[PDB]
Amino acid sequence: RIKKYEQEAAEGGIVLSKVKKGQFRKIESTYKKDIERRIGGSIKARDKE
Amino acid sequence: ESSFMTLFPKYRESYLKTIWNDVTRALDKHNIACVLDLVEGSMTVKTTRKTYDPAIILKARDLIKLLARSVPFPQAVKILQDDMACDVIKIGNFVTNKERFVKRRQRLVGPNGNTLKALELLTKCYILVQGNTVSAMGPFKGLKEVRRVVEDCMKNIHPIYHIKELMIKRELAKRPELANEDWSRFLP
Amino acid sequence: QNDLELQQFLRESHLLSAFNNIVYQ
Amino acid sequence: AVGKNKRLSKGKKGQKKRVVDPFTRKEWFDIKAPSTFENRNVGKTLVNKSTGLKSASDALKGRVVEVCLADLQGSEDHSFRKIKLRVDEVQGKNLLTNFHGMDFTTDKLRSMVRKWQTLIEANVTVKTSDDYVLRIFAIAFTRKQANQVKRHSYAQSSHIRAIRKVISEILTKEVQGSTLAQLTSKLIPEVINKEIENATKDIFPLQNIHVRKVKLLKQPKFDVGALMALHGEEKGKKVT
Amino acid sequence: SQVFGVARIYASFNDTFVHVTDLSGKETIARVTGGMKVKADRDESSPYAAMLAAQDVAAKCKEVGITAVHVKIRATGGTRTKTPGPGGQAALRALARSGLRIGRIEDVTPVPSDSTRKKG
Amino acid sequence: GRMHSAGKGISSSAIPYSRNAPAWFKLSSESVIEQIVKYARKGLTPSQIGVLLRDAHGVTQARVITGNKIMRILKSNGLAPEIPEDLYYLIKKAVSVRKHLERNRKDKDAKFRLILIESRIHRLARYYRTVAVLPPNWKYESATASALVN
RNA sequence: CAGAGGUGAAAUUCUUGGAUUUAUUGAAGACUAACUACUGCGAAAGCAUUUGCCAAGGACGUUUUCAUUAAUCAAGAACGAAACUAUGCCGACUAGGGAUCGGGUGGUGUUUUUUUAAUGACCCACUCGGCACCUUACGAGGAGUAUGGUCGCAAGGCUGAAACUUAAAGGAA
16 A cells, blocks of 8 residues: 555655655554554564664 | 536546546536546536536536546545635745755655644645645635645745644634734734 | 644644544643 | 724715716617628627717727627537627627637636647737738647557657747748638638648647637728628618 | 626635626626625625625616626636635626526636746 | 766777778779878868768778878878867867857856866877977967967 | 725725726736656756857767877866755675666658658667666664752732831722
8 A cells, every 4th residue: 555655646746755764654544543553663674684 | 508628647547437436426416417538538527408506517627627636536525515625826936946945845744744734634624735836625714824834835934833823823713802903922 | 843732733643633533632 | 894893984075976877878789790700790788878979989999899709600619719809880789890819718728738748839920911910829739649658748849849930831821821801711610720730740740739819919001891891871760 | 689798706715806797898887895795894705795796786787688697707816826716606606596697607817827926 | 987078978980800991892092092182182181081081982991991090191192280180170169169258258158168178178289299299389379279270 | 886905803005086896908127837757958056938140068870080198186267044854874886677868770560741842750679878766696971860068049028118106099808
């Protein structure tokens, strides 16, 4: 879904909030389903490696 | 007998095909006919011989404009709602410095979308910052404050100042004691 | 920037918006 | 703010009495298109009163009407364009107007202008053989062929210059070879559009070709015989 | 059979003009305003106000002889906003309800073919 | 670097391996010699000499068709230039731009370009004087420009 | 014909010498809306209507010309109210991938058009050079509490009113 969203806005250019390089973009879907209690901010194994 | 037409590019072609039964349901409910053309990328809306609200056809024109400018279907119908309007605000022609311009509108949208969600929620509006334009839909006041705020942010006043001003005005209006004062001793 | 209620409203803005289905006091 | 909320300015010290009803004293007039068209008669107008028939004459000869081409030709494919007409002469409750200008409207233009293509504009001033000096604006949008995968079919600047030159040449040639009458009789039934298209079919194939706006800069001398001929002498009643 | 006239509607976000005029545009027939009509200085742009203003202008039109209208709607345009107003929409509706035959609608809007400003 | 302009382009001629002419060439070495001489008397720079002789007559390249580079031919026949042709073209360009500025005193872009041109022309003049192929007391100035182009 | 502008609500202001609105204009000095980017250019600051004219430059095609003329550069010379949440490990660097911009070659059918004026659009692979975007081999103090010092801080009593137990008026009650 995040890839669809970034592609959506980027491809019809709608300037967005600059997410870091690591984390996942934050949207209303994740605010509403409360997903990061279960996934996290970003893949910490990749962040440490 | 009136009509209007407006054009979409291909990605909106996809989503428009997906939704088309919905827009035809709504324009049915108001008895207005509409046609989708995939060869010329075109979208027409036309009046019937049984309709009685040319104001509503004007609304429908602005509707299709919004759909082709890619706000999704629920917001399309909320503009077809009675007491609402959308507005295109030009912000390309303010800053000569390209990077300064890009930076200032980024400041407008605010980190993590915070500023955007805050101003939208306060103004009951819906705002889409599109490249070198800004689209805003909502109730008439909401559009008014939005236009002033976005213009100052393209200028060099921070929307952080503007959000605080809106909040203070919000509380002041909420409390019905001072219905005739300047309020400048309150506002920052 | 050093204000405290305003910053809080911003950081909670998304939550309030997607959980209204205005109140921020 | 008729009521008491608003303060008293200078304002209503003494105002005159609404006693006349200029509409009691006005008079209707009927107007008629020039012969180039088909639906000749269009609506009505008003004049103050003929106590100065000098006043009726001068105000009317000043008058400039506009019209929807849909009305003026009975055709909803002709609908999407406006026309301006100028009043020339008055007799027997009949204004016999003469052509003045021609326009697309904001709606059609805005509809026409896409995002991923190339816009083309060209004006030119010409002098028709009728010695009416005139200014023509024509636009044209480039498109992709059916043979395309490119989302954007843009134009190289040399090509754009080439077709501006070509459109200026065709406009010069057509107006010069035409008069005002043939010129309107041409620009109503979509001919210059097609000729421009067939001409520029070679350089860079286009989609939309249009005579956007026609403006009139200065007229030659009035000639009532000629205009009476263009449209198509009376005795009284010996009242006594 | 049918007597036409133009009606320009100036639909601010603050005020409302309905302005009926002979087809040529010279001898205006009627012109009222929300500010002229309502008593609260801010309701002057209420759809209610526009409704009443359209009522009075319709009265004048059905008096004189106007029966059908080419309506051109318009906003402040130019540098400031270019969107019509509550008065414009409600006024078109009120005209229809009064039964004045709508001849032909459009938007005509004072638009800059380029801006009038200063770049920073 | 492709100096003074940051594009890294490469675009030029190659050279075939063989150090001869293609056999199907059947023109006289001396014949091409007088054609060279005649074009030089007409007034063409060695570069244009080579261009004409490898377009018109199937002469692949003069360095192999004859025993010498073409201005070695022209030196053998007494027609060396006073200055190398590239320096001459630079002189012409500088004259052009200076007179351009003088009628048109605001083209700051042209002023910048003139800086570039003077720099390079100084470089080339220095090389020629290092070879001593040009006189050592020789200089560049607008006076030399006028008196040598006019 | 009576308000107009404006604002959250006001107001300043303009308004029977008719404002705001209406149609026809004319002048004035600004800026070039839409098309507008993912891209274009130039050293950077920067750059958008048409059109000549002068004058320069890049990439490419070249079996043209020169024969090491160059590199990086301390100097010097050229050009020139903002700020306010942004941050990617870096380099003598390997294979690249889609998409695009500027040339060039080759195929190839459509659009085009035909002794007159331009042999141009599109698809395709290979190709150099550029903005970018995505994958990849390899590398040499803050926290916070505690204070028997110093240095500042500043305290109460109805007002008057104090050497007077003193007025009016006031405060609380």
